[PDB]
Subunit: 493 residues, 4 copies
């Protein structure tokens, strides 16, 4: 049926009148200013990502205010995402400043703090105390973004390892280190993470991109760290290693969403398997009805070039085909030369891919996996999307305050736009990581509570008409679920 | 049910015991020697491509002779492919002489460059003449015209090549991705081999390893349902000709582990019109039997290889073993995915009208490769006067 | 999946908590008195049939008056049906006067005798006039012409009666069985009530018990999917008027225990064309919801009863409760299977545009009959400006 | 889909060119002669049933020889069926000859043998020793074909019961008695049964209609009784009471087929439930792939009348609709006035019903109930019938010696005739209780073994052409299974 859909397609037929997939942009010096951010919003940005691995609270404070200003001036809602620093293993200091590692040379990595400030080419410090327990002779240690690769030969003692330098590379003070294949038992949240998350709650961020998640128990740690005030902030778990992939089922259940970080995964898992892992994680989230983000090596060559490679274009397209809600941009928007052109092009690719995509395969697949009997919530939303296909309805209107109904509806993948009408601006922002949904804020303060709902309903249809999704004579499937639910098949005037 | 299949998958489970996708290699300075060609075959080459845009007849004669020698010393059959220069007319004067050479040297298939319409395929057929009627024409789609007339082109030709790079010159890259989907799916329906070509693992021509984007490209080509993936510069002039073929084989095997063949089987079966003619019904039913009984191999008796291609069309989730009386067929089935050919010498072994000798040879091959053991089911199909056997392995 | 359903069944399991099929009784000397009519209602009568082939207006006036009194004293709604003499013209001079009487006395439905074509239904409509436009015409198929023109007849009429005895006069009995299958299935598709009539439990008119063949006849009529079964002599002039209605109710309930409503639901849904109009989509989806969530009752807000009939068409495996503002509808829905009507007095209780009062009345009725308790699901549907609610019962 | 099939039907379109259902006739004085039997064969009889409740070995010897003679003279194969007497509870003798039971009178049924020969209206004998154990006050005892109904009031002692006569009826010496609802523990086979079965084997009967089967263990008793010589004779279990219905699953598995005796069932189970029980037993046998016979009250009024009641006509038709292989005639052929006209009419009804029947519903239903993976036998036959629907094949040819493949193929219900080619005349006869199959005997003695099979295959196609099922240009699905199997889709010349 995806096969069958391909036969009817023509590459010369006009694209769809809406883009379902959502674009996340990492903010950096190339895009932090208000006018640069207004550029990105018009280019197709829905979520602004702050990378808390770099820059101070003052720096990310600027981002928060500029993102809020740029959004207000354009009268749109943009989500703010906090990407945590997470746990990190780093080397110590070197005398004096660096150390040049010759290929074939023997060196000693020690876990003893007495060498934290007197590292040399021959012996230097690594700050993770259990390093000796988790690493075995034959294993590899990556240092400085995986540029320096060295192989562990033997245990010199319970604190130091004998290594051989595979790579000629000069390393500086306090470089990050990777332990491919090893079971790292660092805390879920670091001491710095607790501070940054605290800040996130105080500044009212919409979501946390929680780094290096390995088990379900770690998701609770992030929740505890966010505290009672932050109980409504979405936790999106970043899967970065084998543990995260292995524990994916329990992690998905505890998280509000997932991020597939292909680059971090590519460190210790062969790239061919990372492609397959992507399919797995995206499909699992689709069934769960939780947002999924395809992140990392998207249009990276377009950081310095006006156009990407062809293989990169198919990578972005196939992310949509896999069923990803979101596609992410890192250095392309943060430090790149073409921050607007890369977001505009990613939008074009997502829309082109969507035109080829058969949403009915998604609907049918996700429907068949529901056990009988279904519960009310599941039944209503699945049936609503069913009605859309049944009647060739050209829009949907979902009344959801928290965004739960909207996410559940989007889960079943209609072939029409989903308009969500919410009384909460927080929900307008948070739904930006759910594909195929657009938010309309209904001001319950200066417009009333509207228990009759038909003000909120007409507000949704008004939005659908203005965007050109529906006209007179068209069908629109309206749904309000909360379990006080209802489904209306409406004729548009 | 690809979505349902993705859920059950684990990337830490062992890979499949066979690769279904096929690999085509472009021969060049880096790989023309007998020893280099033995390296390629062991790495996973099924088809040798000669690029006639460059080199003389004497140069490509070396390739033809070396490939046949490298193959003989390894006891395997390798397909030899002629890729015409092309341009404007379909066949040029240069092409007419080149195709003349191909017939005389007995090449297995033609990669016809820059094919834009259905009658242009006939010009290539005309140039081959009566002696080369058994040579396959694989049309290369390189422009908007080829994409537009694709329905008629597929009907006239024996297969398609999706040249993404050439199509990219004029069509925006994002649309070339979709065009790949269409071209491959149409070819699957027709039951004719489709080749994904150009810009495959290009960075690995001078680098020890390719980019991640390039890896996903190869994988998704297999996911789209391509019979073949093709290497151009990577084997012709590259620094790592053996490693790039071994890596592509690894990617194809990994992708195949993730691929749900049942979706392919079911999609193609549903598009068949009732009533089905004998050949379609026999073949779809036999593939169905495999799924029905969890059979671990198939045996197809096919002389011309028509039966083998039609069975392959329905995508079993087990290896297909084709027992053929012709070596020509053995080489030609190297562009059809999920098939492995076994030569049965009708000269020094007999005609075998009872067919039990040919069948026994197929089962023996499936046993020797470790596809089926005692107690396993194996669907046998002969359809020249057809028959279907579900055989229990002793 | 009726075959699959038969496997799971046990004849020692308790019967279903409701009967879906409806029973129509012919009033006669044996049953005209108020007390006899109360006996019939308690035994399972939903519809009273007056046979106008015999008796005077004064005689049938007694029936009309007695039925309404017997029904009032039991607080139930009973449908009054006029069965015309018939013959040749559709409506005769006698029929024109009889139908005149029916309108003036406000009968609920007409059983139009010997209907052969679609325009003949219009003659019955003509005879009813503007005052009787809300009276249902159920055409009686009694000959080969009626069977032949059945498609147009069903389209014009509000329902069908399969008169097996009358059809038997000319058509061989074995073909009348098949004709019953066709007529009933066509009516199910149209979503219009179908009545199985004549030769039902005929031996039980003078005998205390019927033959086994007669029992299977009644059961299979329910299996074919008839809304109603009808008693003629058995109640009009019989020795055991109460026992025969109680026994038919028992048979219908037993058959319904064996019947797989999902087969009916699925067969009718598949015959719908995509795209569906709102009404069809709303109703099929609501019945689907019941199966999807194992809901134990349905509530339909319907004034004219169009919604109730359309929901009933899709055959839920749970009771349907129709909340109507009109008593006319309550009586008229007595020929639609699986439906029970609740009267909502719009005069002394309000218009209820919010609909929550009408809905609460339906749930209350489903509670009082023991269909749903706390924790059970109940699909509510209003479709005059439509809406669908899956309500959890408190 | 049966619903959908009904819409396309027209009662004026010509009937099918073959009848699938099979007709069983009970032989009696009305049909025992050779010419009367030749009458029945031409009328549509496939199986001759002997009722061993009545008539001596000499009487049934006559039937066997006359049935064999009548079949030979017409060059057709007819099955001979032995319907066993089975266990029976009877009263004792009365002085002198009878006893008149007044309605409302009190009488005493005793199990004490001393009253076997001096029964009166007041006290008389019943020969079943455990009668006191199985019957409780309030229960009913039926005597003389259920004409005499009396209600047990109390236990007079451990040997006699106090009863009240509900029915005015005069009863004769040694009348049969029923115990509705009671768990009768009489032996599976009686002493007389063992003698009659012995005779059956010696005379080479094809099948046993084993009376009053209550459990699976009883089926083994009949098998043991039939002995090593009779190991190939089919055992068809007669379900006559609640126990048989309750144990149906295990009984079906041990038997070669089932008979639904609606009359015997109607004794203790209300008729409405007997209709439902019929649906259950027929569908269970269809899944099992074992023949099922609808027996008893078929066209009974046609025993004395030239035509049956309309309700009887729909009864016979609905037996076919239920999915019964066979319909049976008892007194209609044994003692009736119109033995030819009743078989001819039953044939007309079966053929008319079949014309309305959608075999594809049967195929699909039985296919969906097969678990994955299927075994070879199941896979081949299901797939063969699939090919028939797939190609609109107009015939099937099955090479089966025992008839196993033929039964398995027929199980899946093709919409075309099934021609079975067997080297065994025993199989030709036995397949007469399997619907939609016709047998061709291939003489392996005077025609060879034919390992190439294509002689047997061409013999089948020859038969299919002669009956007019296939002509030139038609498809025919050929199958040989044994697990040396094969499937050919053949073009007819
Ligand atoms: C300077 C250097 C030394 C080495 C050794 C290497 S290495 O050898 O390749 O690794 C690379 C670089 N290059 C840079 C380093 C820092 C830079 N700014 C920066 C950063 C990156 C982080 C933080 C935290 C802060 S701070 O917190 O505000 O102080 C600041 C100011 C920048 C650059 C650029 O090259 C650059 C080029 C064009 C435009 C802008 C920048 C740029 O901003
Ligand atoms: C402007 C520029 C141009 C060039 C060419 C280069 S060069 O190429 O390195 O020389 C560097 C820069 N400068 C930066 C580049 C990246 C930065 N963030 C960052 C980092 C360090 C790593 C990753 C992995 C990612 S991510 O993957 O995209 O999330 C991100 C966003 C930052 C800066 C800053 O200047 C800066 C100044 C003050 C505070 C914070 C930052 C800052 O955070
Ligand atoms: C005679 C009698 C007494 C009573 C009391 C009653 S009752 O009151 O209604 O029960 C009924 C009857 N009626 C019959 C009884 C026996 C009959 N033959 C017969 C039987 C039935 C079994 C056996 C074993 C043997 S034997 O083994 O060969 O001896 C024979 C000869 C017959 C009849 C007929 O009426 C009849 C009518 C027309 C044609 C043929 C017969 C007929 O053959
Ligand atoms: C010829 C006739 C006409 C009339 C009218 C009548 S009447 O109606 O009773 O008076 C009786 C008869 N005679 C018979 C009737 C039935 C018979 N078998 C039988 C029985 C006794 C019960 C049931 C239940 C069934 S069954 O259900 O059909 O299997 C059957 C076959 C038999 C006879 C014999 O004469 C006869 C003679 C010698 C040996 C054996 C029999 C014999 O077995
Ligand atoms: K980070
Ligand atoms: K689309
Ligand atoms: K070329
Ligand atoms: K696979
Ligand atoms: K009448
Ligand atoms: K039911
Ligand atoms: K018997
Ligand atoms: K038929």
């Amino acid at each position: 049926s995806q096969l069958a859909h391909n036969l009817t397609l023509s590459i010369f037929d006009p694209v769809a009148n809406y883009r379902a997939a959502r674009i996340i942009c990492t903010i950096g010096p190339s895009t932090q200013s208000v006018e640069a951010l207004k550029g990105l919003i018009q280019s197709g940005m829905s979520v602004a990502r702050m990378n808390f691995s770099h820059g101070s609270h003052e720096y990310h404070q600027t981002t928060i205010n500029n993102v809020r200003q740029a959004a207000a001036e354009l009268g749109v809602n943009i989500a703010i995402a906090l990407d945590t620093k997470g746990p990190e293993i780093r080397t110590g200091q070197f005398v004096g400043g660096d150390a040049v590692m010759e290929r074939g040379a023997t060196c000693y990595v020690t876990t003893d703090p007495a060498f934290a400030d007197k590292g040399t080419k021959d012996k230097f410090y690594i700050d993770y105390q259990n390093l000796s327990k988790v690493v075995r002779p034959g294993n590899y240690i990556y240092i400085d973004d995986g540029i320096l690769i060295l192989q562990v030969q033997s245990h010199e003692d319970e604190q130091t390892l004998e290594c051989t330098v595979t790579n000629s590379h000069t390393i500086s003070d306090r470089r990050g280190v990777n332990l491919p294949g090893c079971d790292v038992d660092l805390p879920a949240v670091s001491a710095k993470d607790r501070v940054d998350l605290q800040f996130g709650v105080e500044q009212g961020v919409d979501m946390i991109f929680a780094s290096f998640i390995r088990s379900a128990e770690q998701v609770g740690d992030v929740r505890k760290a966010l505290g009672p005030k932050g109980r409504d902030i979405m936790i999106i778990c970043k899967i970065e290693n084998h543990q995260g992939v292995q524990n994916i089922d329990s992690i998905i259940e505890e998280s509000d969403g997932i991020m597939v970080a292909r680059g971090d995964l590519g460190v210790e898992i062969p790239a061919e398997k990372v492609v397959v892992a992507q399919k797995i994680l995206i499909s699992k989230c689709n069934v769960a009805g939780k947002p999924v983000i395809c992140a990392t090596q998207m249009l990276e060559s377009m950081t310095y070039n006006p156009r990407p490679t062809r293989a990169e274009v198919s990578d972005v397209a196939n992310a949509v085909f896999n069923g990803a809600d979101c596609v992410m941009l890192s250095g392309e928007t943060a430090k790149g030369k073409y921050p607007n052109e890369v977001v505009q092009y990613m939008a074009r690719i997502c829309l082109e891919a969507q035109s080829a995509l058969n949403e009915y395969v998604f609907f049918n697949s996700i429907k068949k996996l529901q056990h009988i009997p279904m519960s009310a919530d599941e039944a209503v939303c699945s049936s609503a999307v069913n009605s859309v296909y049944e009647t060739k309805a050209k829009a949907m209107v979902v009344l959801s305050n928290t965004g739960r109904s909207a996410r559940l509806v989007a889960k079943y993948r209609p072939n029409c736009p989903i308009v969500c009408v919410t009384t909460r601006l927080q929900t307008c922002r948070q739904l930006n990581i759910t594909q195929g949904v657009e938010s309309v804020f209904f001001d319950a303060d200066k417009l009333g509570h509207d228990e009759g709902k038909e003000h909120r309903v007409a507000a949704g249809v008004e939005f659908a008409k203005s965007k050109g999704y529906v006209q007179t004579g068209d069908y629109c499937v309206v749904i309000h679920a909360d379990y006080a639910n209802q489904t209306r098949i409406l004729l548009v005037e």
